[PDB]
């Protein structure tokens, strides 16, 4: 129930505003900046502000905060979803989200803002569908919005029918300073770039544990996804009935399904780091990385971030494999490794100075984060079984998919 959607800037100037109900005066945006400054300076700053009887719930973008004023008991979740959809639409239309396009793409921005939401109730959010009715360089609105299928424009024709899939893995590990892993969750991501002719009805089929149990094959390697979130094209009823993943793929790259299940296996990389920090004299970093992953897999672009002292200067690194550099902007040791074969063991011996004068205030212990990304490795063991591409005209599809394993929330708590 947003009253006026406005786009602010880093200096407090509203780049663009679009009132939806008009029940809130446009002058309330001026008090948002002082209120945000007071909240940030007192630790009470939150994305949902409140100027008396008017609430300013908005998120911070790359360069400006998309603040949407509201006065009644509007749905905060609905406002957040609308803001996320607007951000996605802006990213799809404009390659950059900065003030350079706000003051240059106002002609199409105003039209998009007017068409997207009316009276505070959004109606269209598909960038691909919206690109056929509002352009910055107008015909009747497409029937896709009026029809049930609002995410697949009819009449799409291509020379070839190739669909590229991406089974991206997110290895998130929360290892405490005692050496035990607390939060170890792996979230699957099935992102597909469907490029076919017509409006095919994809029938996704994988070796799901539930599907195998229902079919009676609950004895082989089956993926046990605790949470499975299908896209808008995926029919919820079909999945709820008999685990049938039937949906119309969109034209382009989109997230069809996103599995999310816990992981009870050992970490693919084991980091043994020590801190021999002398009292204002020197420091030692006996960091040893052990790869627990399969030897057939190589972790391309391994970046184990080791937080070094903030005031440390004149550091020396005695490592074994990979380039180690200290970035003063981040104040940490970047253990950058290009290719890390599975089972490899890298040992490092850091040595940096420390000023005699102690710091005025404590700086904390940032967690050690690894940036391992090993492609062609499915840690969860989930493999795509089939993809039923059916078209009324009739064509031979050539679906493709790749498995990518990377490190997600793989942070290591410091001692």
């Amino acid at each position: 129930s947003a009253s006026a959607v406005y786009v602010l800037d880093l200096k407090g100037k509203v780049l663009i505003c679009r009132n939806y109900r008009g029940d809130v005066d446009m002058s309330e945006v001026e008090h948002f900046m002082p209120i945000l400054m007071e909240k940030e300076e007192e630790g009470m700053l939150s994305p949902i502000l409140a100027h008396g009887g008017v609430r300013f719930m908005w998120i911070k973008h790359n360069n400006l905060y998309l603040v949407a004023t509201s006065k009644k008991n509007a749905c905060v979740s609905l406002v957040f979803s609308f803001l996320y959809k607007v951000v996605q639409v802006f990213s799809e239309y404009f390659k950059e989200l900065e003030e350079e396009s706000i003051r240059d793409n106002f002609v199409i921005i105003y039209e998009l803002l007017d068409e997207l939401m009316d009276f505070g109730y959004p109606q269209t959010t598909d960038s691909k569908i919206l690109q056929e009715y509002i352009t910055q360089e107008a015909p009747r609105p497409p029937a896709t919005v009026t029809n049930a299928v609002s995410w697949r424009s009819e009449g799409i024709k291509y020379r070839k029918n190739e669909v590229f899939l991406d089974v991206i893995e997110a290895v998130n590990l929360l290892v405490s300073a005692n050496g035990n892993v607390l939060r170890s969750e792996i979230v699957g991501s099935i992102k597909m770039r469907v490029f076919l002719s017509g409006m095919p009805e994809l029938r996704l089929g994988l070796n799901d544990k539930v599907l195998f149990d229902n079919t009676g094959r609950g004895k082989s390697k089956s993926v046990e996804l605790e949470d499975v979130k299908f896209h808008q094209c995926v029919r919820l009823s079909r999945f709820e009935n008999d685990r049938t993943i039937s949906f119309i793929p969109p034209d382009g790259e989109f997230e069809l399904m996103s599995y999310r299940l816990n992981t009870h296996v050992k970490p693919l990389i084991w980091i043994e780091s020590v801190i021999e920090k002398h009292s204002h004299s020197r420091i030692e970093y006996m960091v040893k990385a052990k790869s627990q992953f399969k030897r057939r897999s190589t972790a391309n672009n391994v970046e184990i971030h080791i937080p070094v002292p903030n005031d440390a200067d004149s550091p020396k690194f005695k490592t074994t494999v990979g380039s180690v550099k200290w970035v003063p902007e981040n104040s940490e040791i970047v253990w950058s490794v290009k290719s890390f074969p599975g089972g490899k063991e890298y040992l490092m011996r850091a040595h940096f100075g420390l000023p005699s004068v102690e710091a005025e205030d404590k700086e904390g212990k940032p967690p050690i984060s690894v940036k391992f990304e090993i492609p062609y490795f499915t840690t969860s063991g989930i493999q795509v079984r089939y993809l039923k591409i059916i078209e009324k005209s009739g064509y031979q599809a050539l679906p493709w998919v790749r498995y990518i394993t990377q490190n997600g929330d793989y942070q290591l708590r410091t001692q």
Binding site: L165, I168, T215, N300, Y376, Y386, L387, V401, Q406
Partner: peptide, 18 residues
């Protein structure tokens, strides 16, 4: 080639499940 694992072709359905 492509970083992150080479793309592999996908099947049409569970041929072993009819």
């Amino acid at each position: 080639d492509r970083k992150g694992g080479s793309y592999s072709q996908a099947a049409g359905s569970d041929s072993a499940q009819s």
